[PDB]
């Protein structure tokens, strides 16, 4: 379970930015999801057209706005991950 450092007021786009641009990660077209109240919520998935279009407006939303609590694990997947990798969210 890897760690990421972002503030509650940080936009979802910034997370996507770290995933894409990090010299260790360099995701090509990542999916970002989280479980809230038992059910999966897709935050942003740029790999499926019908989901990418419907979830694109989430990119301007802050992590707080999306309903994410401190310490929450995000389920992310990408072409460059063999399986889903979890990320632990550290609110700075």
């Amino acid at each position: 379970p890897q760690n990421i450092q972002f503030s509650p007021s940080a936009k979802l786009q910034e997370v996507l930015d770290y995933l894409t641009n990090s010299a260790s990660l360099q995701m090509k077209s990542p999916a970002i999801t989280a479980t809230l109240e038992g059910k999966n919520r897709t935050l942003y998935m740029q790999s499926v057209t019908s989901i990418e279009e419907r979830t694109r407006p989430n990119l301007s939303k802050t992590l707080k706005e999306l309903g994410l609590v401190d310490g929450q694990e995000l389920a992310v997947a990408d072409v460059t991950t063999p399986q889903t990798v979890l990320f632990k969210l550290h609110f700075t």
Partner: protein, 160 residues
């Protein structure tokens, strides 16, 4: 808490993410609800065979115990087909629970596998031996020419 990612979901984030990049050219995928990754529709538009040019819609739902159990798949396009019934149930062995015929479901199977399977129902996995719609196989047996006409009529009415 109630904010922990399930077994099914962890699989599906990966499986759905890779799905569109690995579709048969003849296929397209649609998710009516972007949160419900366990729920999508598939359109197969064959480029050969009896069903060339028809469009065939499929609804698939992946159960909470996914990958130990195969996704449930229903066909939504009324069709005259030996392996797909008029009301839309499907005979795809990959969707069964493997007994002796180790050709059933297995955890090593992914959503990509299912789509390629459904796509083949119009090509290489179209079979009149041990069909699910016995009437259609009988029809094809007795009068292939009239069979094609029924198929064409159904495509023209329900799959255009």
């Amino acid at each position: 808490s109630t904010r922990r990612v399930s077994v099914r979901d962890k699989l599906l984030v990966k499986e759905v993410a890779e799905l569109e990049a690995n579709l048969p050219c003849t296929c397209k995928v649609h998710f009516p609800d972007p949160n419900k990754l366990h729920c999508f529709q598939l359109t197969v538009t064959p480029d050969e065979g009896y069903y060339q040019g028809g469009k065939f819609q499929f609804e698939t739902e992946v159960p909470d115990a996914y990958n130990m159990v195969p996704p449930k798949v229903k066909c939504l396009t009324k069709i005259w087909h030996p392996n797909i019934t008029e009301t839309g149930e499907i005979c795809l062995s990959l969707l069964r629970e493997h007994s002796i015929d180790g050709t059933g479901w297995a955890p090593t199977r992914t959503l990509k596998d299912v789509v390629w399977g459904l796509n083949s129902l119009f090509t290489d996995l179209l079979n009149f031996d041990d069909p699910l719609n016995i009437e259609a196989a009988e029809h094809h047996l007795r009068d292939k020419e009239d069979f094609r006409n029924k198929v064409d009529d159904y495509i023209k009415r329900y799959a255009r």
